[PDB]
Amino acid sequence: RLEEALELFEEMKEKGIVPNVVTYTTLISGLGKAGRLEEALELFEEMKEKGIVPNVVTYTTLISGLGKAGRLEEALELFEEMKEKGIVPNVVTYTTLISGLGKAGRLEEALELFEEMKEKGIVPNVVTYTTLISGLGKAGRLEEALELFEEMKEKGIVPNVVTYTTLISGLGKAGRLEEALELFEEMKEKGIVPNVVTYTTLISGLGKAG
Secondary structure, eight states, rough: HHHHHHHHHHHHHTTTTTHHHHHHHHHHHHHHTOOOOHHHHHHHHHHHHTTTTOOHHHHHHHHHHHHTTTTTHHHHHHHHHHTTTTTOOOOOHHHHHHHHHHHTTOOHHHHHHHHHHHTTTTOOOOOHHHHEEEEEEEOOOOOHHHHHHHHHHTOOOOOOOHHHHHHHHHHHHOHHHHHHHHHHHHHHHTTTTOOOOHHHHHHHHHHHHO
């Protein structure tokens, strides 16, 4: 009921009443999910200016939408600022961040973020994983992409088609046909349908040998 809440908020302000950090955090959350970013920004400015101290939720909602927007430098600004004010970031902040840093080809920083997130005792997820592995493979760092795949399984996370297609394509280009094979089999074991790219690269390598 976000539009009603807003009407109420305007009526509140009009009769000269002080907004509370809670009314602000909920408004920023609703505006953020509603995908209407900039409005959530105006509200962040009223909030900072009126001296209200934001929670971890205002920061996470903003950085999530900021990342999807592709406004990485700003999202980062926030992330750092939040860190200063002692607000300890959750899994989503990190995920949106590394997802954006990967989409931005700023890999090693995304790496550092992952190591930091693990250091702060945060739990990486299937999104943080598939994104980091796809990032490593896309940059030709196949070896690491592998290690990370393995450790991702080691934590019981089930990869999806992307991590597979990317690794198999890389292994196929690389000439490590045997592993690309066991991996093809393993990815069938889990019942997922392979991609056209996997098939063609596989037949191409399988063909060029034996």
